[PDB]
Protein backbone atom coordinates (compact mmCIF):
# COMPACT_ATOMS: atom_id res chain seq x y z
CA UNK A 1 0.00 0.00 0.00
CA UNK A 2 1.61 3.23 -1.13
CA UNK A 3 -0.95 5.48 0.60
CA UNK A 4 -0.25 5.58 4.33
CA UNK A 5 -2.67 6.77 7.06
CA UNK A 6 -0.35 9.84 7.16
CA UNK A 7 0.73 11.45 3.85
CA UNK A 8 2.63 14.64 2.99
CA UNK A 9 2.43 16.52 -0.35
CA UNK A 10 4.14 19.25 -2.10
CA UNK A 11 2.75 21.60 -4.61
CA UNK A 12 4.03 23.81 -7.40
CA UNK A 13 1.55 26.19 -9.01
CA UNK A 14 1.98 28.69 -11.78
CA UNK A 15 -0.54 30.92 -13.28
CA UNK A 16 -1.92 34.28 -14.10
CA UNK A 17 -5.15 36.08 -13.34
CA UNK A 18 -6.01 39.08 -15.59
CA UNK A 19 -2.45 38.96 -16.88
CA UNK A 20 -0.75 39.03 -13.52
CA UNK A 21 1.65 36.13 -13.49
CA UNK A 22 2.60 34.28 -10.29
CA UNK A 23 4.09 31.17 -8.76
CA UNK A 24 3.22 29.48 -5.50
CA UNK A 25 4.72 26.56 -3.70
CA UNK A 26 3.37 24.61 -0.83
CA UNK A 27 4.02 21.74 1.50
CA UNK A 28 1.18 19.95 3.29
CA UNK A 29 0.21 16.85 5.40
CA UNK A 30 -3.02 15.00 6.13
CA UNK A 31 -4.79 11.77 6.84
CA UNK A 32 -5.89 10.43 3.48
CA UNK A 33 -8.54 7.92 4.98
CA UNK A 34 -9.79 10.35 7.55
CA UNK A 35 -10.60 13.09 4.96
CA UNK A 36 -8.10 15.72 6.50
CA UNK A 37 -5.36 17.96 5.60
CA UNK A 38 -3.42 21.14 6.11
CA UNK A 39 -0.87 23.05 4.09
CA UNK A 40 1.52 26.00 4.13
CA UNK A 41 1.73 28.05 0.88
CA UNK A 42 3.68 30.91 -0.28
CA UNK A 43 3.82 33.23 -3.16
CA UNK A 44 7.23 32.74 -4.62
CA UNK A 45 6.82 34.93 -7.73
CA UNK A 46 4.47 37.87 -8.44
CA UNK A 47 3.71 38.50 -4.77
CA UNK A 48 1.67 40.23 -3.22
CA UNK A 49 -1.14 39.00 -5.49
CA UNK A 50 -3.40 41.75 -7.02
CA UNK A 51 -6.41 39.58 -6.36
CA UNK A 52 -8.19 37.53 -3.66
CA UNK A 53 -6.39 34.44 -2.42
CA UNK A 54 -9.81 32.80 -2.32
CA UNK A 55 -10.02 32.10 -6.09
CA UNK A 56 -6.82 30.12 -5.71
CA UNK A 57 -7.58 28.12 -2.52
CA UNK A 58 -9.84 25.46 -4.17
CA UNK A 59 -7.13 24.83 -6.82
CA UNK A 60 -4.34 24.26 -4.26
CA UNK A 61 -5.99 17.69 -3.31
CA UNK A 62 -8.50 14.80 -3.68
CA UNK A 63 -6.35 11.94 -2.52
CA UNK A 64 -7.50 13.00 1.01
CA UNK A 65 -11.16 12.33 0.68
CA UNK A 66 -12.70 9.99 3.24
CA UNK A 67 -14.73 7.16 1.55
CA UNK A 68 -16.97 4.54 2.86
CA UNK A 69 -15.87 1.01 2.21
CA UNK A 70 -18.33 0.37 -0.51
CA UNK A 71 -17.61 3.43 -2.65
CA UNK A 72 -14.51 2.77 -4.58
CA UNK A 73 -11.84 5.50 -3.87
CA UNK A 74 -10.93 5.98 -7.54
CA UNK A 75 -8.42 8.70 -6.87
CA UNK A 76 -6.48 6.80 -4.23
CA UNK A 77 -6.57 3.53 -6.33
CA UNK A 78 -4.90 5.68 -9.08
CA UNK A 79 -1.48 5.73 -7.15
CA UNK A 80 1.37 5.47 -7.32
CA UNK A 81 1.17 6.78 -10.92
CA UNK A 82 -1.53 9.23 -10.01
CA UNK A 83 -4.27 11.19 -11.73
CA UNK A 84 -4.81 14.53 -13.60
CA UNK A 85 -7.81 16.89 -13.57
CA UNK A 86 -9.10 19.92 -15.61
CA UNK A 87 -11.50 22.37 -14.14
CA UNK A 88 -13.54 25.31 -15.22
CA UNK A 89 -15.08 27.81 -12.74
CA UNK A 90 -17.55 30.30 -14.01
CA UNK A 91 -18.18 33.24 -11.71
CA UNK A 92 -21.37 35.18 -11.75
CA UNK A 93 -19.62 38.50 -12.72
CA UNK A 94 -17.98 36.98 -15.84
CA UNK A 95 -14.63 35.95 -14.44
CA UNK A 96 -13.52 32.44 -15.27
CA UNK A 97 -10.78 30.36 -13.79
CA UNK A 98 -9.45 27.30 -15.64
CA UNK A 99 -7.06 24.79 -14.18
CA UNK A 100 -5.05 21.77 -15.22
CA UNK A 101 -3.30 19.60 -12.63
CA UNK A 102 -1.10 16.53 -12.44
CA UNK A 103 -0.89 14.54 -9.15
CA UNK A 104 1.61 11.73 -8.67
CA UNK A 105 3.71 10.18 -5.89
CA UNK A 106 7.46 10.45 -5.45
CA UNK A 107 9.55 9.68 -2.39
CA UNK A 108 6.52 8.67 -0.36
CA UNK A 109 4.84 12.04 -0.89
CA UNK A 110 2.12 13.33 -3.20
CA UNK A 111 3.39 15.84 -5.78
CA UNK A 112 0.93 18.32 -7.31
CA UNK A 113 1.72 20.42 -10.35
CA UNK A 114 -0.95 23.01 -11.13
CA UNK A 115 -1.52 25.60 -13.96
CA UNK A 116 -4.24 28.21 -13.29
CA UNK A 117 -5.54 30.94 -15.55
CA UNK A 118 -8.02 33.53 -14.39
CA UNK A 119 -9.44 35.91 -16.95
CA UNK A 120 -12.17 38.49 -17.42
CA UNK A 121 -12.43 39.48 -13.80
CA UNK A 122 -13.75 43.03 -13.50
CA UNK A 123 -11.11 45.51 -12.34
CA UNK A 124 -13.71 46.67 -9.89
CA UNK A 125 -14.96 43.26 -8.83
CA UNK A 126 -14.72 41.47 -5.45
CA UNK A 127 -11.84 39.28 -6.69
CA UNK A 128 -9.56 42.12 -7.99
CA UNK A 129 -10.50 44.44 -5.13
CA UNK A 130 -9.62 41.63 -2.66
CA UNK A 131 -13.02 41.76 -0.92
CA UNK A 132 -13.81 38.08 -0.28
CA UNK A 133 -13.96 36.13 3.00
CA UNK A 134 -13.64 32.42 2.22
CA UNK A 135 -15.82 29.65 0.88
CA UNK A 136 -18.96 28.21 2.45
CA UNK A 137 -19.01 24.41 2.67
CA UNK A 138 -20.12 22.70 -0.52
CA UNK A 139 -21.00 19.30 -1.91
CA UNK A 140 -19.61 18.13 -5.21
CA UNK A 141 -21.79 15.68 -7.18
CA UNK A 142 -19.32 12.91 -8.34
CA UNK A 143 -20.39 10.73 -11.24
CA UNK A 144 -18.53 8.54 -13.79
CA UNK A 145 -18.86 9.81 -17.37
CA UNK A 146 -17.05 8.99 -20.58
CA UNK A 147 -14.52 6.82 -18.70
CA UNK A 148 -13.61 9.57 -16.16
CA UNK A 149 -14.80 10.85 -12.78
CA UNK A 150 -16.56 14.17 -13.05
CA UNK A 151 -17.81 16.56 -10.26
CA UNK A 152 -19.99 19.47 -10.38
CA UNK A 153 -20.90 21.95 -7.68
CA UNK A 154 -22.09 25.44 -6.91
CA UNK A 155 -19.41 27.10 -4.75
CA UNK A 156 -20.13 30.26 -2.76
CA UNK A 157 -17.68 32.92 -1.69
CA UNK A 158 -18.54 34.98 1.36
CA UNK A 159 -18.28 38.73 0.78
CA UNK A 160 -17.14 41.41 3.24
CA UNK A 161 -20.82 41.90 3.06
CA UNK A 162 -23.18 39.22 4.29
CA UNK A 163 -24.07 37.90 0.88
CA UNK A 164 -22.30 35.68 -1.54
CA UNK A 165 -20.39 35.67 -4.80
CA UNK A 166 -21.08 32.51 -6.75
CA UNK A 167 -19.30 30.06 -9.09
CA UNK A 168 -20.53 27.15 -11.18
CA UNK A 169 -17.84 24.55 -11.29
CA UNK A 170 -17.05 21.45 -13.46
CA UNK A 171 -14.05 19.16 -13.06
CA UNK A 172 -12.96 16.03 -14.87
CA UNK A 173 -10.66 13.78 -12.80
CA UNK A 174 -8.99 11.05 -14.71
CA UNK A 175 -6.71 8.32 -13.28
CA UNK A 176 -3.57 7.52 -15.24
CA UNK A 177 -4.66 3.83 -15.37
CA UNK A 178 -8.30 2.62 -15.60
CA UNK A 179 -9.04 1.84 -11.85
CA UNK A 180 -12.58 1.17 -10.66
CA UNK A 181 -14.72 4.10 -11.18
CA UNK A 182 -17.39 4.64 -8.47
CA UNK A 183 -21.06 5.05 -9.05
CA UNK A 184 -22.41 8.51 -8.47
CA UNK A 185 -22.22 10.03 -4.95
CA UNK A 186 -21.43 13.33 -3.00
CA UNK A 187 -18.26 14.79 -1.55
CA UNK A 188 -18.78 17.29 1.26
CA UNK A 189 -15.88 19.79 1.49
CA UNK A 190 -15.05 22.60 3.90
CA UNK A 191 -11.95 24.65 3.07
CA UNK A 192 -10.64 27.18 5.59
CA UNK A 193 -7.94 29.77 5.47
CA UNK A 194 -6.44 29.16 8.98
CA UNK A 195 -3.61 31.70 8.96
CA UNK A 196 -2.91 34.52 6.54
CA UNK A 197 -0.71 36.88 7.89
CA UNK A 198 1.75 37.89 5.21
CA UNK A 199 0.59 39.51 2.57
CA UNK A 200 -1.69 36.89 1.84
CA UNK A 201 1.89 36.01 0.57
CA UNK A 202 2.13 33.23 3.24
CA UNK A 203 -1.03 31.40 3.79
CA UNK A 204 -2.16 28.17 5.52
CA UNK A 205 -5.29 26.17 4.64
CA UNK A 206 -7.20 23.36 6.24
CA UNK A 207 -9.59 21.16 4.32
CA UNK A 208 -12.03 18.42 5.25
CA UNK A 209 -13.53 16.15 2.57
CA UNK A 210 -15.95 13.27 2.95
CA UNK A 211 -17.48 10.94 0.44
CA UNK A 212 -21.06 9.78 1.08
CA UNK A 213 -23.85 8.01 -0.61
CA UNK A 214 -26.57 10.24 -1.79
CA UNK A 215 -30.25 10.07 -1.22
CA UNK A 216 -31.01 11.96 -3.07
CA UNK A 217 -28.51 14.00 -4.40
UniProtKB/TrEMBL annotation:
The keyword Signal does not apply. Keywords: Chromophore, Luminescence, Photoprotein. InterPro entries: GFP, GFP-related, Green_fluorescent_prot. One of its GO terms (biological process) is generation of precursor metabolites and energy. (R)-malate binds at residue 8. The keyword Coiled coil does not apply. Gene3D superfamilies: 3.30.1300.40, Green fluorescent protein. Belongs to the GFP family. This is Fluorescent protein plum. It comes from Discosoma sp. LW-2004.
Amino acid sequence: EVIKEFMRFKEHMEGSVNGHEFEIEGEGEGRPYEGTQTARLKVTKGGPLPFAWDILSPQISKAYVKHPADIPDYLKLSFPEGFKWERVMNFEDGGVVTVTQDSSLQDGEFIYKVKVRGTNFPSDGPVMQKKTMGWEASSERMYPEDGALKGEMKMRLRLKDGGHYDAEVKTTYMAKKPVQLPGAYKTDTKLDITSHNEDYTIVEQYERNEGRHSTGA
